[PDB]
Design a protein around this ligand. Structure first.
Ligand SMILES: *[C@@H]1O[C@H](CO)[C@@H](O)[C@H](O)[C@H]1NC(C)=O
Ligand SMILES: COC(=O)COc1ccc(C#N)cc1
Length: 338
């Protein structure tokens, strides 16, 4: 179990003004820290956020959060369930800012909601240093779905923040799960992101922002555009046929749909050709790293926990780190989730 702590700085809030927070399980004999970002889409204007507040309030408020949560998958402390990092200090950061972890705007007389996702990550890092993070060797910022996109938007800022607080020895890395999307043609979204960044006062990594400049920062929400600009090491986990991608493509089998789906897999494979640390199975699914059975999927004979260990070795023969399926249809990999 991971135990809840609400932020001592009460000006860093969820959408409705209640304090943000984090769940923590310490491991006193470890110098490794894992901070995981939850996903769950976003909202981009008043009416759209009002509807989310009616039916998805735990994604907008901490008032009903439970005091504990069970760590699963990469957040499990059990070696059998988590061969990679079972002995690490575990942190789960709930998503309550509805801004893909990009916002930096307070609630005020002019703002019905607060969008502080980027400030929430930095405040969790600040408060954790006094709970042992100051003696860390590696900080892995991971996340799934919008939390995976949030890793791409925030990993370099976490490193810059510790670099100037006097901790140049902590190695910051990123693990982005199911957050790597294509801005392709629909079979039958970018505007919603463009409006959301304005509503949120959203921020994107500095070099990417300088490439695309004012009004075009929405480009930095797409992995193949922002990843080339990043300085920190980032491991990319991505189903070739992500359910969230098919949703924004209005896909719910004739020749037309067949060619559409095969072209989607081929294009995603191509965007990963120059990503040296990556795991991309040919499956139709959604998320992986916090699932209890994340140890079961394999690409070219190698599991994800093994690939991540090989990544660790490469940063310190038969230990690969670039694993991308080449077969062209969902479930051509026999280890896909059922
Ligand atoms: C609390 O957080 C806000 C938002 O990041 C920041 O402006 C302020 O300086 C913080 N105050 C303290 C005492 O940490
Ligand atoms: C969020 O969790 C999910 O359910 C699907 O993943 C997403 C959705 C939207 C965005 C953006 N911008 C990034 C990732």
């Amino acid at each position: 179990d991971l135990r809840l702590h609400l932020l001592l700085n009460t000006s860093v809030t969820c959408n409705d003004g209640s304090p943000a927070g984090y769940y923590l399980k310490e491991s006193r004999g470890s110098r490794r820290w894992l901070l995981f970002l939850e996903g769950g889409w976003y909202c981009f204007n008043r009416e759209n956020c009002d509807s989310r507040y009616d039916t998805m309030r735990r994604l907008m408020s901490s008032r009903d959060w439970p005091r504990t949560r069970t760590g699963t998958g990469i957040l499990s402390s059990q070696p059998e369930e988590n061969p990679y990092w079972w002995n690490a200090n575990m942190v789960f950061i709930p998503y309550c800012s509805s801004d893909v972890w990009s916002g930096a705007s307070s609630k005020s007389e002019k703002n019905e909601y607060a969008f502080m996702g980027a400030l929430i990550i930095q405040e969790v890092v600040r408060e954790l240093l006094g709970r042992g993070l100051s003696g860390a060797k590696v900080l892995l910022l991971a996340g799934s779905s919008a939390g995976g996109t949030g890793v791409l938007l925030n990993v370099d800022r976490v490193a810059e923040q510790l670099e100037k607080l006097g901790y140049p020895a902590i190695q910051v890395r990123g693990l982005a799960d199911s957050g790597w999307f294509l801005d392709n043609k629909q079979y039958r979204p970018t505007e919603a992101i463009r409006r959301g960044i304005r509503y949120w006062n959203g921020v994107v990594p500095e070099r990417c922002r300088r490439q695309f400049q004012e009004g075009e920062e929405w480009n930095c929400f797409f992995g193949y555009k922002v990843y080339p600009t990043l300085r920190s090491p980032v491991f990319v986990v991505q189903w070739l046929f992500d359910e969230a991608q098919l949703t924004v493509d209005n896909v719910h089998v004739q020749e037309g749909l067949r060619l559409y789906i095969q072209n989607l897999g081929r294009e995603l494979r191509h965007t990963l050709k120059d990503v040296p640390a990556s795991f991309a199975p040919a499956c139709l699914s959604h998320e992986i790293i916090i699932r209890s059975h994340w140890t079961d999927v394999q690409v070219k004979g190698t599991s994800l926990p093994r690939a991540l260990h090989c990544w660790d070795r490469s940063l310190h023969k038969g230990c690969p780190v670039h694993l991308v399926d080449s077969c062209p249809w969902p479930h051509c990999n026999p280890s896909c989730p059922t």
